[PDB]
From Swiss-Prot:
Protein name per its UniProtKB record: Heat shock protein HSP 90-alpha
Region: Interaction with NR3C1, residue numbers: 1-207
Localization: Nucleus; Cytoplasm; Melanosome; Cell membrane
Domain notes: The TPR repeat-binding motif mediates interaction with TPR repeat-containing proteins like the co-chaperone STUB1.
PTM per Swiss-Prot/TrEMBL: ISGylated.
Assembly and binders: Homodimer. Identified in NR3C1/GCR steroid receptor-chaperone complexes formed at least by NR3C1, HSP90AA1 and a variety of proteins containing TPR repeats such as FKBP4, FKBP5, PPID, PPP5C or STIP1. Forms a complex containing HSP90AA1, TSC1 and TSC2; TSC1 is required to recruit TCS2 to the complex. The closed form interacts (via the middle domain and TPR repeat-binding motif) with co-chaperone TSC1 (via C-terminus). Interacts with TOM34. Interacts with TERT; the interaction, together with PTGES3, is required for correct assembly and stabilization of the TERT holoenzyme complex. (Microbial infection) Interacts with herpes simplex virus 1 protein US11; this interaction inhibits TBK1-induced interferon production.
Family per similarity comment: Belongs to the heat shock protein 90 family.
Residues with PTM N6-acetyllysine: 42, 68
Effect upon mutating residue 31 to A: Strong ATP-binding. Strong interaction with HSF1, HIF1A, ERBB2, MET, KEAP1 and RHOBTB2. No effect on interaction with TSC1
Impact noted for substituting residue 77 to A: Impaired ATP-binding. Strong interaction with HIF1A, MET, KEAP1 and RHOBTB2. Loss of interaction with HSF1 and ERBB2. Los of interaction with TSC1
Biological source species: Homo sapiens
Binding site for ATP: 35, 77, 96, 122
Organism classification: Eukaryota, Metazoa, Chordata, Craniata, Vertebrata
Purpose of the protein: Molecular chaperone that promotes the maturation, structural maintenance and proper regulation of specific target proteins involved for instance in cell cycle control and signal transduction. Undergoes a functional cycle that is linked to its ATPase activity which is essential for its chaperone activity. This cycle probably induces conformational changes in the client proteins, thereby causing their activation. Interacts dynamically with various co-chaperones that modulate its substrate recognition, ATPase cycle and chaperone function.
Residues of the full protein shown: 17 to 223 of 732
Length: 207
């Protein structure tokens, strides 16, 4: 288990997301689904010129899996996945500029729902989750588990869990007062409202 500090701008973003009073928390789900859709587009595009990139799984889809016993909502995709370098370094580097922009827009009276326009929508997970675990497998790399409860650090370990072929699972460990996002009718409503035209099957699992 390796522990890393977020870049200061990302930690500041996460604290803003956690601390700002903002009731429209449900938008976290469309930001994660949007990320999954971009990742699926990416592997789909890469496969057109190298069909072997689909040896790790041809099916291109999104699963939403609520688990009341564990209090988690998991967004699974079979998209391109992330490398260790993505997790530790590259995503944060990319996230640096979007963070500043977003934080700037927030006076000029943007609101948190617009976070996705700045390429940092992943962090809106922290509107509803006390802890986020990301399990991910990219073709050129091993399977990894990233985790963070915010507070300025995250961990990365090689994952010994169930091998996943290729793709990413974002496991949201929900805050005590956010269990509505475990309810089928609530998830269905949100997907219909914000993610109704995603170009991949989204299967909402039931409990
Ligand atoms: C900024 C988008 C790329 C990183 N990314 C994201 C957001 C993202 C940002 C920062 C960290 C993170 O995982 C720990 C994930 N979701 C992805 C996905 N489902 N598949 C592939 N890559 C993903």
């Amino acid at each position: 288990v390796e522990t890393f500090a977020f870049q200061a701008e990302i930690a500041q973003l996460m604290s803003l997301i956690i601390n700002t009073f903002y009731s429209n928390k449900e938008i976290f789900l469309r930001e994660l689904i949007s990320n999954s859709s971009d990742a699926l587009d990416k592997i789909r595009y890469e496969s057109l010129t190298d069909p072997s990139k689909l040896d790790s799984g041809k099916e291109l889809h999104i699963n939403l899996i609520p688990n009341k016993q564990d209090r988690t909502l998991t967004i699974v995709d079979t998209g391109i996945g992330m490398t260790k370098a993505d997790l530790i370094n590259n995503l944060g580097t990319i996230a640096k500029s979007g963070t500043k922009a977003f934080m700037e827009a927030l006076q000029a009276g943007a609101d948190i729902s617009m976070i996705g326009q700045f390429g940092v929508g992943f962090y809106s997970a922290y509107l509803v989750a006390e802890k986020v675990t990301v399990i991910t497998k990219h073709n050129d790399d091993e399977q990894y588990a990233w985790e963070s409860s915010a507070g300025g650090s995250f961990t990365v370990r090689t994952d010994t869990g169930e091998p996943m072929g290729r793709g990413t699972k974002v496991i949201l460990h929900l805050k005590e007062d956010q269990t509505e996002y475990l309810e089928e009718r609530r998830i269905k409503e949100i997907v219909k409202k914000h993610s109704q035209f995603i170009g991949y099957p989204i299967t909402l699992f039931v409990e």
